[PDB]
Scaffold this active site. Structure first.
Site, short mmCIF file in Angstrom:
data_model
loop_
_atom_site.label_atom_id
_atom_site.label_comp_id
_atom_site.label_asym_id
_atom_site.label_seq_id
_atom_site.Cartn_x
_atom_site.Cartn_y
_atom_site.Cartn_z
N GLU A 3 0.89 -1.17 0.08
CA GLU A 3 -0.02 -0.08 0.00
C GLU A 3 0.83 1.35 -0.12
O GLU A 3 1.80 1.31 0.88
CB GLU A 3 -0.80 -0.11 1.34
CG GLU A 3 -1.86 1.21 1.38
CD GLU A 3 -3.13 1.03 2.21
OE1 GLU A 3 -2.87 -0.11 3.05
OE2 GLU A 3 -3.77 1.98 2.44
N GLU A 16 -3.77 -10.24 -13.20
CA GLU A 16 -2.87 -11.56 -12.88
C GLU A 16 -1.71 -11.10 -12.18
O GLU A 16 -1.20 -9.93 -12.04
CB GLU A 16 -2.26 -11.65 -14.52
CG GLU A 16 -1.16 -12.97 -14.29
CD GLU A 16 -0.61 -13.05 -15.68
OE1 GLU A 16 -0.81 -12.23 -16.55
OE2 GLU A 16 0.15 -14.02 -15.85
N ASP A 41 3.60 7.00 -16.26
CA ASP A 41 4.38 6.98 -15.02
C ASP A 41 5.55 6.19 -14.97
O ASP A 41 5.78 5.53 -13.90
CB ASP A 41 3.34 6.76 -14.03
CG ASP A 41 3.96 7.11 -12.27
OD1 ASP A 41 4.88 7.98 -12.31
OD2 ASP A 41 3.26 6.20 -11.39
N1 LIG Z 1 0.04 -7.46 -11.25
C1 LIG Z 1 0.79 -7.55 -10.22
N2 LIG Z 1 1.80 -8.46 -10.08
C2 LIG Z 1 2.70 -8.57 -9.05
N3 LIG Z 1 2.77 -7.35 -8.12
C3 LIG Z 1 2.01 -6.44 -8.73
C4 LIG Z 1 0.97 -6.42 -9.46
N4 LIG Z 1 0.49 -5.17 -9.27
C5 LIG Z 1 1.02 -4.59 -8.46
N5 LIG Z 1 2.04 -5.42 -7.79
C6 LIG Z 1 3.13 -4.90 -6.63
O1 LIG Z 1 2.54 -3.94 -6.00
C7 LIG Z 1 3.42 -2.52 -6.05
C8 LIG Z 1 2.30 -1.40 -6.44
O2 LIG Z 1 1.40 -1.46 -7.34
P1 LIG Z 1 1.37 -0.19 -8.51
O3 LIG Z 1 2.90 -0.07 -8.92
O4 LIG Z 1 0.76 -0.60 -9.89
O5 LIG Z 1 0.70 0.73 -7.70
P2 LIG Z 1 1.26 2.22 -7.52
O6 LIG Z 1 0.04 2.77 -6.55
O7 LIG Z 1 1.25 3.18 -8.88
O8 LIG Z 1 2.89 2.11 -6.79
P3 LIG Z 1 4.22 2.36 -7.40
O9 LIG Z 1 4.70 3.74 -7.04
O10 LIG Z 1 5.06 1.36 -6.87
O11 LIG Z 1 4.28 2.26 -8.98
C9 LIG Z 1 4.15 -2.91 -7.40
O12 LIG Z 1 5.18 -1.80 -7.57
C10 LIG Z 1 4.30 -4.26 -7.29
O13 LIG Z 1 5.48 -4.46 -6.58
#
Ligand SMILES: Nc1ncnc2c1ncn2[C@@H]1O[C@H](COP(=O)(O)OP(=O)(O)OP(=O)(O)O)[C@@H](O)[C@H]1O
Length: 269
Positions: free
Chosen positions: A100, A167, A205
């Site tokens: 989170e 996935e 991003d």
């Molecule tokens: N499909 C997925 N498979 C594996 N892990 C994932 C997946 N989606 C999210 N995660 C994990 O959760 C973290 C956060 O998800 P995501 O990056 O899409 O959201 P964010 O809110 O934009 O955060 P970030 O700043 O890390 O990019 C990822 O960087 C990854 O480690």
């Protein structure tokens, strides 16, 4: 208190009050009690009592300054969105939090149909409406992923509310891994960015935090800021994804790639 325990405290009357908030989000932040009540077909005093209880559980926020109205918290809108996923039969059980931060909470979950998944619950023209903006982020991510199917991004299974089900990728963030062939990995990222662009998508991003990597390859995730090619500022946004990833490789590995040529190459294809 976990989202699975919170889910377990919800009865049919609770769900119907929250449906009534959700369906009126499009024309209020705080949905008036009278409308929650008229939509849910639940008497006013009893709707008020369900709401006060939902507030105690931090699912809704109730305000009384101008009028008695209610909206979702982050937890609440997430819980509701999960509910819609569970009722569609796309999710059976939510699992443990994977991480989170500022933009999303990402949970493990299991689907009979789709297997072992993640569900990502999203948070967050005059530059100075929580729920509608989180649901628009969700949906944007979902559509981008759909348009990218077949490339190195998660398979996408569903979208409800502020939630996207997709996935599970078994790979780590680029940032946490030291690669021994950085030039080739940087080129595989830039090639995928070129394939996004040919499909009319800019990621929006791109960073070391949303390229995942293993021995098997890379994946790109995180598309809620993605735009279509042709939308306002798309080209400058694409340039920023290219410049940013190249800059990360320069700082970490002293990779030598020229930023303007990399962009021109992507753009001419
Ligand atoms: N499909 C997925 N498979 C594996 N892990 C994932 C997946 N989606 C999210 N995660 C994990 O959760 C973290 C956060 O998800 P995501 O990056 O899409 O959201 P964010 O809110 O934009 O955060 P970030 O700043 O890390 O990019 C990822 O960087 C990854 O480690």
């Amino acid at each position: 208190m976990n989202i699975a325990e919170l889910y377990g405290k919800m009865g049919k009357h609770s769900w119907r009050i929250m449906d009534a908030i959700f369906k009126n989000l499009w024309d209020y932040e705080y949905v008036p009690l009278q409308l929650i009540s008229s939509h849910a077909r639940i008497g006013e005093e009893k709707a008020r009592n369900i709401l006060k209880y939902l507030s105690d559980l931090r699912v809704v926020q109730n305000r009384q300054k101008d009028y008695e109205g209610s909206t979702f918290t982050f937890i609440g809108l997430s819980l509701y969105s999960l509910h819609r996923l569970v009722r569609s039969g796309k999710v059976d059980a939510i699992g443990k939090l994977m991480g989170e931060g500022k933009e999303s909470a990402v949970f493990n979950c299991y689907s009979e149909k789709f297997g072992e998944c993640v569900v990502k619950f999203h948070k967050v023209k005059v530059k100075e409406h929580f729920s509608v903006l989180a649901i628009r982020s969700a949906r944007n991510e979902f559509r981008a992923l759909q348009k990218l199917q077949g490339l190195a991004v998660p398979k996408v299974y569903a979208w409800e509310g502020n939630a996207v089900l997709m996935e599970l990728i078994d790979a780590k963030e680029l940032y946490r891994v030291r690669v021994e062939n950085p030039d080739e990995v940087l080129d595989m990222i830039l090639e995928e960015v070129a394939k996004f662009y040919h499909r009319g998508i800019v990621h929006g991003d791109l960073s070391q935090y949303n390229v995942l990597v293993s021995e098997e390859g890379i994946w790109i995730i995180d598309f809620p800021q993605s735009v279509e090619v042709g939308e306002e500022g798309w080209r400058e946004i694409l340039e920023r994804d290219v410049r940013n990833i190249i800059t990360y490789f320069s700082r970490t590995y002293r990779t030598e790639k020229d930023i303007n040529s990399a962009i021109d190459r992507i753009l001419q294809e």
